[PDB]
Structure 1
Amino acid sequence: SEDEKDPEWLREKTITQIEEFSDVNEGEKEVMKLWNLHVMKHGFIADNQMNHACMLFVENYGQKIIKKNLCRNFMLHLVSMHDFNLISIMSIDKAVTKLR
């Protein structure tokens, strides 16, 4: 195939572009790095997928969230989607259970 969802060099370039931002603390910076790299890895496009990506992303990297100890930033990152209507309350509960 030689083709897939996401080329490697693209992953490198986006990570580098993240570091350029100065207003973002590294706790947040890692958050979208994992979350974004989760995205074009799978290429979700639907709101249903958006929610399904939530328990999916926490399922794969919830331990890594503990390892990075960037949970609190990650809950806030979730709340934005609930403000963007892509997240329901019970979805937030799922992340808490997965984390703990």
Structure 2
Amino acid sequence: SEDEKDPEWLREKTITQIEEFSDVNEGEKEVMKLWNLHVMKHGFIADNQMNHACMLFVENYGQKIIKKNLCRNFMLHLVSMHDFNLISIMSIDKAVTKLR
């Protein structure tokens, strides 16, 4: 196939652009990275997916979230998600359950 959901060089291409921005702190800069990486890993398109995807994501790297100490920064990301009407109320609850 020589092709997948996401060719490699794009990943390195985008993360370099991630560090280009200045007004974003590194703690809130890394949360940009792994979020966008997993999205392009699966290529979701619809609203149904991201409600499931966040639960998929939180279990996928929740332990990694502990090491990088972005648990609280990720919460603000989830807060923005509901502001975008893209996430439900209970989905926030289950995230903390997987988080801890």
Q: Deviations over 1:32-86 (max 9, x none)?
A: 2001000010000111101011101101010000010111110000111100011
**Partner residue, 1:11:** 11
Structure 1's unaligned 5+ residue stretches are none
Residues 1:85 and 2:85 are matched in the alignment: yes
Deviation at 1:8, TM superposition (A): 0.6
CA distance in 2, matches of 1:96, 1:89: 12
Segments of 5+ residues of structure 2 without an aligned counterpart are: none
The equivalent of 2:25 in structure 1 is: 25
RMSD over aligned Cα, in angstroms?
0.6
CA distance in 1, matches of 2:73, 2:28: 6
Between the aligned partners of 1:50 and 1:35, the Cα distance in structure 2 is: 11
Residues paired across the two proteins, number: 100
Over the matched positions of the two proteins, sequence identity in percent amounts to 100
| CA distance in 2: counterparts of 1:50 and 1:66, whole angstroms | 22
SS of 1:2's partner is coil
